[PDB]
Design a protein around this ligand. Structure first.
Ligand SMILES: Nc1ncnc2c1ncn2[C@@H]1O[C@H](COP(=O)(O)OP(=O)(O)O)[C@@H](O)[C@H]1O
Ligand SMILES: [Mg+2]
Lengths: 139, 372, 7, 747
């Protein structure tokens, strides 16, 4: 990362600083990474964080300088398509099935997050063009 | 399954039947008759020679030969007719179908078993055979495993001690007093009252007087005095033609030679001293069990009072702390056959048979190898 | 028998 | 291996035979970290593996062979879930139907359901007793060959309820009007009163095999049943172990001693008689014998046994009891006599109408006869007691056979029977703390029946394989003939028992010695219990069983002295006693040899036929509705052979899937390149990649056959792929959504 990148990342980090001390929580490190264009799993986030315990995850605070090596480590389409084609074969996917799998398998998300991202993308039959939704969510 | 035959040649009687039966199908005298006169009528259907119940029926015309005497087979061409009659006419069964069990007195000549075997495999073509010591079978019949057995038929007498199914061969006594020598003595003594019997066809009469009238005295010299002084003892018998004979103090003298073979000029001791001497040859831990289980067996022991006379005269020899019991079951004339009937039915036995496949390899000497 | 007796 | 993190595994537990666990960290070639339901880690150790668990889709399926891991805890789980939570009391294993007795009445037997099953094919439905009955009823029509339903279990399990509904089905689908159902059901109280016993472990155990032949005409209208009985346990009549009873009818009779018509039987209380006091357990708690009597007499009268014959029957059973009290005095070690004016014999002769002096003579002597001559010979006190008890067993076995003939007279119909369907009700495999000749016979019968079942299943598998064109050499046949030959064949344990009964001074000790000499090292299945010389072990089909030699020989023995029969046949007081003995080696045969022959008659009856099998299991010892004790149920499932059946099935290709339904399930693993137009070739390609060892599956014409385990493997790799896909998608949507929240914070 060059000085400009480091400055942009630090600025973004400071926007997520909700206490004014220039720091985030372990549990926010992943959030910052996602805010910076990374898409790490919660497992990946905990791994780069050093698998913190609940107490330090919720209250131990780290500044940008400690975050940066972690961002580096995190930084270092056809599969995404096949992954969506898993749940198809007419190029559509049920909203109910996607909701169930996203809220019940893997690193389960909330139904509200899924409703928010899914709002407006399914048609009257309840089918999602997943290639278009995928291009949309990858931009 | 095919049940085996049990055929107790004995002497004088043949006893035969199927294993698991409780009495023999066939009991007939082991006697071969040939006609001696000239046959005069023509077209009569004359027949060369008669076996068994025929020769008894027609005996006035015949000469009667016993082929077995003193448990030794002395004429094989006679004997084979008797077996032939046993299988084919009397049991009405082909012996080639199923096994046969045969019985023999102990200590008799070795070649007798070899001939029995050779005839059973060669002519009758029996699938398997065995020969068994008679006195062993009398224990199977009386339901015991420890015994001393006085087995005495026509022809032969023997004692065999058996303790828990171990026989004690050094102590086996054999004696040749038998029903035939009581009969020949009874002929030579009836002559004192003038009656006379010189032919085989009337030797067969004396043999039946002996059976009905004779009995054994509990003490000899007082009944000898009694019936010499009072005629109250004498009894009478009808000969076949209707002549009446009368027999007095004589009718206990012939069965009493079993206890004094000196009367017919044998050296040896009677059945009581041979029984006791047979016990004495056994070792001292077992004598008390032999003294309790004395088992009478075979027909010559049927005389009334022979049990009580034995118990008396062995108690006269045994040490008085011992206890002496004579077991004389009423069947005892058949106990050798009954014993062979249970023996041949035991599932454990089926291995024991001399099979034809063995005999064809080893020859007739196999008997001494695989039998007792 | 063969010696000592008649059979 | 694939014991990975979040593999579930079963672990053995004392209190409920197995517990679920979850494998908390991957296995690698000594001890496993296992998360339990009770606590997050408790640790398990591996000995000089735990049984893996089936995937959640398979559990609860209608047919236990659909499972991919076939073993005790998965079977126990499927029966437990289906029974407890879904209240389905019927389940299939292979051919077998397993019926879990609910102890509760249920709506499932209604006539609408009867219609719902009629005309279906077998697999088309969830299993129900009607689906067995229907399979039989169609096969009888489709083919000439006659049919049997075999019902096995403990008597508590409710075999009578299964037979009841199987007949109700036959009546309704025949459209028949007649009245056989009512009569066959109304026969049960007499057959249970005579033929049924209280054992150490069960009350109303059934001690015979009962075969009801439902006859059909040439048009398959019903014609009314013929009843046969086999394998009756005659020895129970005269001997009982601790806290057993003999057949209920004796205790029902003794309880009724106050009733006016039973005055002349001069009964006592049930411990007054030698044939009932021996168990020391006269009363079953919860039963009034005094009242079961009345239901027996009602059942008689509904079958139209006249009141005169009913008093004849109870006169004979009072006979048997009074006979048993007759007590011989030894005169001598080899002779005996009954003492003068002995009272039990007086009352027995008064009951049976015989001259006291003839019975007193013939009990103590026996007659030999050759054709020319006959001898009356005395017998020992031991033989006198064996003779008396053989006579009592013979009077009883004949009375039983007579009552069953009057049942048949009330059940027969004149119409010519075209064909029949038999319902055979029989006891299961049996094992107790102390184990004895009664059990030895029962376990031999169950060996014969399990052989027939293995013949049949193997045959139907060769048919199914030739339908699907798969080589026969792949199905192995498991054979228990080496165990039957240990028992029934020559020099077997029965043959050496009969041979010991008649060898002189035979005894249970010297019998045992013959066993050891003959078998101990020579046979794979016979073993000696280390610490005893008076017992032996047979490795039966279902389990090892230790039998104790003490007192087989006294149980083994029958000889009826024919002259004692010939005295009783002369009786002139009442009709029945001469009737019993209407038409020898038959008297000479021992109990074991009679049983061996009765079992041959049974097997030659069933072999004429096409079997269909049912198994009944008892879920709890306390009759609680719809509760399922794993500790009891495992034992019942072993005893019914269900588990050794499944062990045999798991050796084959248990799991059978149609190509199109397979393709539907597993296209998720299949690249959209690689699916062809040809389904069969597509799946042949994919599966030949997914499971590299071809020995795990066969390509039938219509179905893939998998060995046990591989369908679970495919389900695991499917779940792992589907999870990895879900993680990739969902992390991308999360990083998108928070990236947009970052754009919100920049705004
Ligand atoms: N009831 C009897 N009383 C006395 N002697 C008998 C009696 N029956 C047979 N005998 C004699 O004993 C011999 C028959 O004995 P048995 O045991 O039948 O011979 P084996 O067993 O050798 O054939 C014959 O001599 C016969 O005379
Ligand atoms: Mg003799």
């Amino acid at each position: 990362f060059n000085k400009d990148q480091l400055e942009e990342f630090k600025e973004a980090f400071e926007l997520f600083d909700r206490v004014g001390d220039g720091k985030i929580l372990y549990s926010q490190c992943g959030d910052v990474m996602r805010a910076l264009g990374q898409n790490p799993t919660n497992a990946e986030v905990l791994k780069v964080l050093g698998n913190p315990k609940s107490d330090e995850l919720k209250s131990r605070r780290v500044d940008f300088e400690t975050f940066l090596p972690m961002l580096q480590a995190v930084a270092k389409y056809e599969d995404y398509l096949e992954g969506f084609r898993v749940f198809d074969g007419n190029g559509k996917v049920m909203g109910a099935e996607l909701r169930h799998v996203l809220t019940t398998l893997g690193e389960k998300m909330t139904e509200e997050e899924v409703e928010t991202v899914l709002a407006g993308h399914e048609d009257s039959n309840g089918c999602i063009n997943y290639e278009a939704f995928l291009k949309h969510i990858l931009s | 399954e095919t049940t085996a035959l049990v055929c107790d040649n004995g002497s004088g009687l043949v006893k035969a039947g199927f294993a698991g039966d409780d009495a023999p199908r066939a009991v007939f005298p082991s006697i071969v008759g040939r006609p001696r006169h000239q046959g005069v009528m023509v077209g009569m259907g004359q027949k060369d020679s008669y076996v068994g119940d025929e020769a008894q029926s027609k005996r006035g015309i015949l000469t009667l030969k016993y082929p077995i005497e003193h448990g030794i087979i002395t004429n094989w061409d006679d004997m084979e007719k008797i077996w032939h009659h046993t299988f084919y006419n009397e049991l009405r069964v082909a012996p080639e179908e199923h096994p046969t069990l045969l019985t023999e007195a102990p200590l008799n000549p070795k070649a007798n078993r070899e001939k029995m075997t050779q005839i059973m495999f060669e002519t009758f073509n029996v699938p398997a055979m065995y020969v068994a010591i008679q006195a062993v079978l009398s224990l199977y019949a009386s339901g015991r495993t420890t015994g001393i057995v006085l087995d005495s038929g026509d022809g032969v007498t023997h004692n065999v001690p058996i303790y828990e199914g171990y026989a004690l061969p050094h102590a086996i006594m054999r004696l040749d007093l038998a029903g035939r020598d009581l009969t020949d003595y009874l002929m030579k003594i009836l002559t004192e009252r003038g009656y006379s019997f010189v032919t085989t066809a009337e030797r067969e009469i004396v043999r039946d007087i002996k059976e009905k009238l004779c009995y054994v005295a509990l003490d000899f010299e007082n009944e000898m005095a009694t019936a010499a002084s009072s005629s109250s003892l004498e009894k009478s018998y009808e000969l076949p033609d209707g002549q009446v004979i009368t027999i007095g103090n004589e009718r206990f003298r012939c069965p009493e030679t079993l206890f004094q073979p000196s009367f017919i000029g044998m050296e040896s001791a009677g059945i009581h001293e041979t029984t006791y001497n047979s016990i004495m040859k056994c070792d001292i831990d077992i004598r008390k069990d032999l003294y309790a289980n004395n088992v009478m067996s075979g027909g010559t022991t049927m005389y009334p009072g022979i049990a009580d006379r034995m118990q008396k005269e062995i108690t006269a020899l045994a040490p008085s702390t011992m206890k002496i019991k004579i077991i004389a079951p009423p069947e005892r004339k058949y106990s050798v056959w009954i014993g062979g009937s249970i023996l041949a039915s035991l599932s454990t036995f089926q291995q024991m048979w001399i099979t034809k496949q063995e005999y064809d390899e080893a020859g007739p000497s196999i008997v001494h190898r695989k039998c007792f | 028998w063969x010696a000592x007796c008649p059979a | 291996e694939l014991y990975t993190k979040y593999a579930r595994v079963w672990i053995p537990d004392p209190e409920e035979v197995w517990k679920s666990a979850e494998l908390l960290k991957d296995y690698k070639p000594k001890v496993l970290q296992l998360r339990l339901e009770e606590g997050k880690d408790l640790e398990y150790c591996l000995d000089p593996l735990p049984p893996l668990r089936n995937p959640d889709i398979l559990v609860g399926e209608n047919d236990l062979t659909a499972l991919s891991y076939l073993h005790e805890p998965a079977v126990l789980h499927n029966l437990k879930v289906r029974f407890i939570d879904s209240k389905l009391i019927y389940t299939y294993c292979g051919i077998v139907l397993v019926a879990i007795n609910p102890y509760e009445q249920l709506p499932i037997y209604g006539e609408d359901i009867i219609n719902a099953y009629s005309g279906q094919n077998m697999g088309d439905m969830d299993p129900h007793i009607f689906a067995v009955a229907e399979e039989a009823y169609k096969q009888m029509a489709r083919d000439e060959r006659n049919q049997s339903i075999i019902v096995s279990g403990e008597s508590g399990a409710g075999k009578t309820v299964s037979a009841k509904y199987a007949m109700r089905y036959f009546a309704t689908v025949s459209g028949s009007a007649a009245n056989v159902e009512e009569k066959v059901l109304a026969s049960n109280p007499i057959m249970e009163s005579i033929g049924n016993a209280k054992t150490t472990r069960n009350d109303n155990s059934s001690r015979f095999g009962k075969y009801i032949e439902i006859g059909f005409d040439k048009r398959y209208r019903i014609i009314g049943a013929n009843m046969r009985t086999y394998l009756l346990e005659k020895s129970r009549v005269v001997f009982q172990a601790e806290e057993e009873r003999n057949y209920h009818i004796f205790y029902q009779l003794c309880a009724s001693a106050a009733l006016p018509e039973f005055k002349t039987l001069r009964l006592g209380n049930a411990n007054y008689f030698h044939y009932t006091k021996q168990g020391g357990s006269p009363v079953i708690d919860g039963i009034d014998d005094a009242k079961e009597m009345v239901n027996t007499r009602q059942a008689c009268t509904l079958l139209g046994i006249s009141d005169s014959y009913q008093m004849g029957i109870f006169r004979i059973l009072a006979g048997i009891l009074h006979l048993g009290n007759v007590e011989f005095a030894s005169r001598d070690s080899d002779s005996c006599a009954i003492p003068p004016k002995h009272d039990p014999l007086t009352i027995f002769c008064d009951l049976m109408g015989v001259d006291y002096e003839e019975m007193a003579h013939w009990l103590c002597h026996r007659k030999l006869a050759t054709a020319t001559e006959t001898y009356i010979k005395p017998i020992s006190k031991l033989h006198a007691i064996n003779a008396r008890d053989a006579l009592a067993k013979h009077i009883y076995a004949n009375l039983f056979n007579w009552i069953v003939d009057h049942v048949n007279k009330a059940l027969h119909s004149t119409v010519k029977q075209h064909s029949f369907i038999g319902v055979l009700d029989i006891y299961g495999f049996e094992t107790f703390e102390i184990n004895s000749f009664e059990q030895f016979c029962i376990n031999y019968a169950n060996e014969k029946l399990q052989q027939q079942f293995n013949m049949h299943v193997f045959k139907l598998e060769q048919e199914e394989y030739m339908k699907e064109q798969i080589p026969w050499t792949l199905i192995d046949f498991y054979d228990n003939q080496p165990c039957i030959n240990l028992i029934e064949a020559k020099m077997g344990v029965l043959d050496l028992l009969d041979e010991e009964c008649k060898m002189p001074k035979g005894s249970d000790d010297t019998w045992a010695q013959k066993l050891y000499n003959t078998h101990l090292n020579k046979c794979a299945l016979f073993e000696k219990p280390r610490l005893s010389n008076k017992a032996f072990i047979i490795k039966h089909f279902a389990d090892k069983v230790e039998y104790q030699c003490e007192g087989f020989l006294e149980k083994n023995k029958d000889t009826v002295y024919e002259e004692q029969i010939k005295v009783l046949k002369s009786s002139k007081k009442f009709k029945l006693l001469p009737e019993l003995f209407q038409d020898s080696k038959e008297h000479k045969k021992t109990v074991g040899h009679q049983f061996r022959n009765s079992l041959h008659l049974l097997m030659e009856t069933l072999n004429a036929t096409t079997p269909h099998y049912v198994r009944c299991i008892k879920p709890n010892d306390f009759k609680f509705p719809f509760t399922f004790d794993e500790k009891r149920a495992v034992q019942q499932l072993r005893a019914c052979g269900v588990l050794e059946t499944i062990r045999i099935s798991a050796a084959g290709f248990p799991s059978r899937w149609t190509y199109q339904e397979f393709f539907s399930r597993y296209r998720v693993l299949m690249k959209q390149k690689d699916v062809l137009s040809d389904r069969k070739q597509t799946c042949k390609n994919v599966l030949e990649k997914l499971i590299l060892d071809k020995d795990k599956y066969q390509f039938g014409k219509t179905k893939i056959f998998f060995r046990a385990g591989q369908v679970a493997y495919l389900e695991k790799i499917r779940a792992d792929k589907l999870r990895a896909a879900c993680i990739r998608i969902q992390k991308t949507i999360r990083g998108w959504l928070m990236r947009k929240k970052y754009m919100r914070m920049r705004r």
